[PDB]
Design a protein around this ligand. Structure first.
Ligand SMILES: Cc1cc(O)ccc1C1=C(c2ccc(O)cc2C)[C@H]2[C@@H](S(=O)(=O)Oc3ccccc3)C[C@@H]1[S@@]2=O
Ligand SMILES: Cc1cc(O)ccc1C1=C(c2ccc(O)cc2C)[C@H]2[C@@H](S(=O)(=O)Oc3ccccc3)C[C@@H]1[S@@]2=O
Lengths: 234, 10, 234, 9
């Protein structure tokens, strides 16, 4: 059914499927310890995860997949998806990451957690890049869907996934042409957007090794769901 | 068994 | 700069011309491998490929226009991605096997000889299988490899790098139009090629964690250059 | 850095 949608219908479907922005826990006395920051972030990430899973079901084509393939794709892409969402909502806050409306952090606060500032810097650089490209909401939702379908497709049905992926590419180009971009500008912008996905994969892998580290350090107990999504990368 | 499984089939 | 004034066909020729050679392994076929002996051969081979890659990079248009510090950064970031894409490219015509060298063609069962290597083997093979199904062309391959070099670490100077990147995108599209592909097919294929770069980043990150592991295990001593390129990812 | 030297030529 995803294959018969127009570009504008694809955009509407994706826009409509967007998960909500969640709030962090409250009056958690600034300043943060390593343990308290990790606590908040873990609690937040866990809740975002539940919403992401339901968002995925609303991504055209995704439900046409077998359960096993849906699981595979989500286990592969979950952190990439949380990350791109984070940088998207951080766009209008240069220098800071908007984990939640009531939790906006700069890199100095990322120092409170051992090894986190490196990933912070990369997330901020990504936000800065989106900002400079003037990334649009319609483009963002396309990218996030691409991540869901693409990241795990090579560790496998595949043909259908690639068809859907092709459709989203069509959708992206459609959008750029509407913005008045020339043919050359369209392929250049398409290229630029898709190359950032490589950096996002990178941030995810570095973030992953790291969640594993803190688990080991058992500073804060990770949620059952996070641990599951985490162990899948092993 | 997976929590993901449950969340996925709701 | 000079890379920016090249035609698409001139870009292709420059890249084709800059290609490093295929190197031979040491290796005596009259003896199965141990973990230690396989790692020994692979390490010796990778080390020598590295020297050639570094010189290839200097022949990539735009690269030498960069400051030394930036050249170092890009290479430290992309080195394994580049070795990997080269490996899968030369493995294309050998389904099920990886052509590490003309005298060293291995299947996944042999990848089992090294602890943790078979996972990365499987991903490399899947990549090779994907290139094969897309009928990836040599001209497209060299464009992709250059994109990796310039893109992976791209975190003014940046603007120039992005211009060069834009040029290679132009070159890729130029090639596809020559192959008779329609506008829609061109965008779709461009997208498909660039998305595989995300998987290549992924393979690199997983491979990296691992080279670190074996170093620690000190099964085989890594070369001075490999260790340097490795430590850069820390 | 060996990479440094190899780069410089
Ligand atoms: C990306 C993200 C989304 C979100 O909703 C909440 C938190 C995060 C991030 C991190 C995180 C922290 C604790 C968790 O239990 C889960 C996550 C995802 C950390 C990073 S990470 O998880 O990808 O990598 C690390 C996480 C913790 C410590 C070190 C690295 C991204 C942001 S913050 O920088
Ligand atoms: C990709 C590659 C290119 C090459 O010219 C030589 C070897 C490799 C590969 C590996 C490798 C082995 C020993 C080394 O010193 C360096 C490398 C790169 C292993 C992997 S890896 O390095 O990316 O990941 C691992 C490395 C060592 C052990 C296990 C995994 C890719 C292929 S083989 O599967």
């Amino acid at each position: 059914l995803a294959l018969s949608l127009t570009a504008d219908q694809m955009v509407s479907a994706l826009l409509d499927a967007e998960p909500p922005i969640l709030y962090s826990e409250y009056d958690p006395t600034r300043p943060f310890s390593e343990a308290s920051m990790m606590g908040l972030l873990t609690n937040l990430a866990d809740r975002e995860l539940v919403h992401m899973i339901n968002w995925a079901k609303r991504v055209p084509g995704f439900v046409d997949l077998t359960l096993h393939d849906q699981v595979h794709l989500l286990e592969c892409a979950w952190l990439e998806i949380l990350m791109i969402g984070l940088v998207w909502r951080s766009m209008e806050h240069p220098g800071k990451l908007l984990f939640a409306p009531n939790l906006l952090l700069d890199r100095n606060q990322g120092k409170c957690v051992e090894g986190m500032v490196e990933i912070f810097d990369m997330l901020l650089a990504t936000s800065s890049r989106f900002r400079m490209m003037n990334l649009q909401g319609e483009e963002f939702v396309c990218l996030k869907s691409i991540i869901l379908l693409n990241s795990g497709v090579y560790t496998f049905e595949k043909d259908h996934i690639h068809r859907v992926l092709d459709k989203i590419t069509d959708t992206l180009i459609h959008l750029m042409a509407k913005a008045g971009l020339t043919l050359q500008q369209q392929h250049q912008r398409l290229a630029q957007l898709l190359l950032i996905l490589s950096h996002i994969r990178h941030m995810s892998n570095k973030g992953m090794e790291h969640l594993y580290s803190m688990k080991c350090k058992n500073v804060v107990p990770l949620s059952d769901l996070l641990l599951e999504m985490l162990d899948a990368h092993r | 068994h997976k929590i993901l499984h449950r969340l996925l089939q709701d």
